[model samples]
Target: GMTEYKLVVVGADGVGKSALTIQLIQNHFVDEYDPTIEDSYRKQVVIDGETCLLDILDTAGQEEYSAMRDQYMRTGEGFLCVFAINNTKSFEDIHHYREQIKRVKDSEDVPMVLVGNKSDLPSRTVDTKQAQDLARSYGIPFIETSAKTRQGVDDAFYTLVREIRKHKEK
Candidate 1:
C-alpha cells in the first residue's frame, strides 16, 4: 500500500506559485497571467520511492482571499511557502504567511519549507540573511530555487518530502 501525503504550495500572488507547480509537475514553464483565484489542486510525482500524493493548493495573493487562504491551510500535511528572491516585499511577507499557517492549522510543529523563487535575477535580492533567519526561527528548511533555470526545484520538493517523512516518523 502507498502512503498518502498532501503538500500545499502557497505564497503571495505572482510569487511564482504556479511556475513552481508547473515546473515540478509538467517540467515546462509558461508565462501566462491567468491568476489562480481560489485553489489549484494537483498530484505530484513520488519522491524517494514513496507513493505520495501532493495536493498543491494555490490561492490568490490579494488581501481579499484571506478567508479562502485560512480554509486551505487547515487541510494540508505540509506547506511550501514561496517568495520571489527578486521581490523584497514578497520575501518579507513570508513571516505573515507563516503566522497565518500557524493560526489556521493550529499547529506550531507543522512541516514547512521556505522557498526563495526567481533566484535567476541576482540584482533584486532584498536580504538573503533575513530569509535564512526567518526559516531558522521556524526550524524549517530553506532553499533558493529558479523555476526558469530549474535550479534547486527538484531538490526543494525532495527536501520537503524528507522533512515530512521525518516528522511522520516521530
Candidate 2:
C-alpha cells in the first residue's frame, strides 16, 4: 500500500528551515530563500521498504504568518520541528511551535521530530545534550542536520515518517 504523508517543516525565522527542506527534496542546499511565503514540496521515496509519498509544507516563520499555522497544522500528519543549533532564540522558539501543533491537532500524541539544523557551524549555543533532553521530555526523536553538507537530511525526514507510521499503528 502506498501512503501519502503530509509533513510540515516548522521553526522560527533564520533557522534555515527552507534549506533543510530543499536539501531533502532537491538534493542540494540553498543559501537564501524568501521566508515570508509558504512553500509546498512533494517527493516519493521508499522508506523501510514502504513506498510513500511525502507532501511537505515549508512554512513562513515570520510572526505575521502565525495565523496560517493552524491551517497547515490541521492538515499535516507529521511535523519536522526545526531549530538552528547556533542560535539560542531559534532553539527556544521550538517550544511554541510544538505547543501550537498539539493545540491545533487536539492531541498530545502527534508525530514530530525535533531537528537541530546548521550542525556544520563551528560556533554553537544549543548543546546536543540539551536538545536531546528536551526531545526525551517530549518523547520524540531528535536529529542534527546540516543541509549544506546533506548530513542527516534523509534521516530527519524518514524518521518523521516512521513516527507517523507508529502513531497510526497505535
Candidate 3:
C-alpha cells in the first residue's frame, strides 16, 4: 500500500512560500499571486527510495493570521517553514511558525525543514549562517532555495518528506 502524507507550506507575507511550492511541484516561478486562500497539490514522490503519495496544503502568508487553524497543524504530517533570504522580519517570524506547529501538533518533535527562499535575489539580507543557527537550535534541517533558478527546492521538500517518513516509522 502506498502511504499518503499531508504537508503544509507556511511563512510570513511575501516570504516566497508560494514561490517555493510552485517551483517544486509546478516547475515554475511566479512573480506575483494573490495567495490569500488555500491551495492543494498532489505529487507521487520517493522518500528514502520508497515510493509514496504526497499531498501539500499551501496557506497564503498573513502575518495577522498567525495561529490560524490548529487543526491544520494537527493533521499535517510535516512542514516546510519558509522565510525569504532578503527579509529579516520574515526570518524573525520563523519562531512563531515553529511554535504554532508544535502547539497544534502537541509535539516538540514535529517534522519540519527550515527553508531560505529567494536565494537568487540580489537584495540579500538574511545570512545562511543565521538560518542554519536557528535550525540547529530546533534540531531541524536548513536548506537554501532559489525559486527563480529552481535550485535546492526539491532538496528542501524531499528532506522534510524523508524525515516525516522516519518519524512515522519510529
Candidate 4:
C-alpha cells in the first residue's frame, strides 16, 4: 500500500490555482476557464523511491465560496498557497489564506509551501526576495511556478509531499 497525500491548493481568484492543479494532474495548461468551486484529482507516482498517491483538491478562491474552505482544510495533509507573481493583491492574500489553514488545523506547524505562479508573464510585481522572506517566516518551502510553461509545477507539489512526510515523521 502506498502513502496517500491530501494536498490542497489555496489562493485568491485568478491567481492560477486551477491552472497549477490541472497542469500537475492532467499534464496540460489551462489557458482559460470558468471559476472553480471544487475539483479533485488523484495521481500515483514514485517520490523518493516510494509510490505515493496524491489526492489534490483544487478549491474555489472566490469570497463567495469562502465558507467551504475550512472543511477542505481539515482533511488536507499539505497545502500549496498559490499567488500570482504579477498580481500584488493576490500575493497579499497569501497571509490570510495561510492563517485560515493554520486556524482550521489548530496547529502552527503544518505542511505548506508558498507558491508564486504565472512566472512566465513579462510583468512582475511580487519579488522573489519578499516571497522567500515570508516563507522563511513560516519555516516552509517556497517555489515559483508557471502552469503555462510547466516550470516548478512538479517541484512545488513534490516538495509539499516531502513536507508532509517530514511533518508526519516528526
Which of the predicted structures, 3 or 4, would earn the higher lDDT when compared with the native?
Answer: 4
Candidate 4 lDDT tens digits, 1-170: 77899999888889998899888878899888678567788999888898999999888744543546567578999999999999999999988988888888899898999999999999999999999999999999999999999999999999999999999897
> What are the runs in model 2 whose C-alpha is more than 4 Å off?
61-69
Worst 10 residues of 1 by lDDT: 56-65
Tens digits of per-residue lDDT, candidate 2, 32-146, equal: 7887778889999999999999999988844533656567568999999999999999999889989888988999899999999999999999999999999999999999999
**lDDT of candidate 2 at residue 157, scale 0 to 100:** 96
* Candidates 2 and 3 compared by lDDT, better number: 2
Clashing pairs in 1: 13-61
Q: Rank the candidates by TM-score, best first.
A: 2, 4, 3, 1
lDDT of each: 0.79, 0.91, 0.86, 0.89
Better lDDT candidate (1, 3): 3
Q: What are the runs in model 4 whose C-alpha is more than 4 Å off?
A: 61-69
TM-score of model 1 relative to the true fold?
0.87
Per residue, candidate 3 scores C-alpha lDDT tens digits across 1-170 of 99888889988878877777778787998998776866888889887788988888888643443454665557899999999999999999999889988888888899999999989888889999989999999999999999999999989989998879779887
Top-down lDDT ranking: 2, 4, 3, 1
Per-residue CA lDDT of model 1 for 35-139, tens digit only, reads 745556666467878777666666664664477656866877788999998888888788887887788888788889999988888686767687889889889
Cα RMSD, each candidate: 2.2, 1.7, 2.0, 1.8
